[PDB]
């Protein structure tokens, strides 16, 4: 599903993102815009080092979710990358959730520095009653 701007907004917000371990809303969106463009069946094969990010979030196959097919991975999120990969995006925003849970935080997706951070996020939530 490609969700439109606000409609995520609100979503998100619904799940309870709104300043999660510090993370505003703002935040999230701009990641998410990012990472997949809002699109929850978004997947990437990394040939670099045999990972695949799955999602609206591109999470990581190697620490968080199992596909099986990731050499020495790990599954932080207990889920199968499968369910990254639903209309419904409640697995993946508690992934989410458990990732910044981490010491890193936000900082673990290089596009969140590259692309948000120190930047104006507003435009991401504007107009969308959140």
């Given at each position: 599903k490609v ?60 620490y968080?979710?199992?596909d ?25 925003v ?15 997706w ?21």
């Amino acid at each position: 599903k490609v969700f439109e701007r606000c409609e995520l907004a609100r979503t998100l917000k619904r799940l309870g993102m709104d300043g999660y371990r510090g993370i505003s809303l703002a935040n999230w969106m701009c990641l998410a815009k990012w990472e997949s463009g809002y699109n929850t069946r978004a997947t990437n094969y990394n040939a670099g080092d045999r990972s695949t990010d799955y999602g609206i979030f591109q999470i990581n196959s190697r620490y968080w979710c199992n596909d099986g097919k990731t050499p020495g991975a790990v599954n932080a999120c207990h889920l199968s990358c499968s369910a990254l990969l639903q209309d419904n995006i409640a697995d993946a925003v508690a992934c989410a959730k458990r990732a910044v849970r981490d010491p890193q935080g936000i900082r673990a997706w290089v596009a969140w520095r590259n692309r948000c951070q120190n930047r104006d996020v507003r435009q991401y939530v504007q107009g969308c009653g959140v």
